[PDB]
């Protein structure tokens, strides 16, 4: 058959996910970071609002301050344009 290399970076989204996972994050923290990373466009701007993310979390313990802290840690991500 053809060569079928099948090797490519996932638009750094996989790189971002690995880097966030590479950084020490708690299981709940890792889940929150993964959710935040999922809410990333190709340009690098978040499609969903912080309130939308908190609603998707569906946890009474989850709050705006904790979500903002997680996003700010996520904001200073590995590559540029992670604002």
């Amino acid at each position: 058959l053809p060569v079928y290399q099948g090797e490519t970076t996932q638009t750094l989204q996989d790189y971002l996910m690995w880097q966030v996972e590479l950084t020490p994050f708690t299981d709940t923290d890792r889940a929150i970071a993964t959710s935040i990373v999922d809410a990333v466009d190709d340009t690098g701007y978040l499609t969903i609002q912080i309130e939308d993310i908190v609603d998707s979390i569906g946890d009474d313990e989850i709050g705006l301050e904790e979500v903002e802290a997680v996003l700010k840690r996520i904001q200073r991500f590995d590559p540029v344009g992670v604002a």
Binding site: Y4, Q5, G6, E7, T8, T9
Partner: protein, 50 residues
């Protein structure tokens, strides 16, 4: 040629191979035979999973 972590294939999820875009070497069956002659079963588990 060396590699630590590069790109794998879509098919069977293995790295490319013979220095085609930062590839890797290929392990032999005589080699796994010799490893079994050493009997480092945990080494083979690392070899097959890690």
């Amino acid at each position: 040629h060396a590699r630590s972590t590069g790109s794998y294939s879509l098919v069977t999820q293995q790295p490319l191979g013979g220095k085609a875009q930062f590839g890797g070497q290929r392990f032999g069956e005589m080699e796994v035979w010799a490893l079994e002659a050493y009997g480092a079963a945990y080494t083979l588990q690392e070899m097959l999973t890690v």
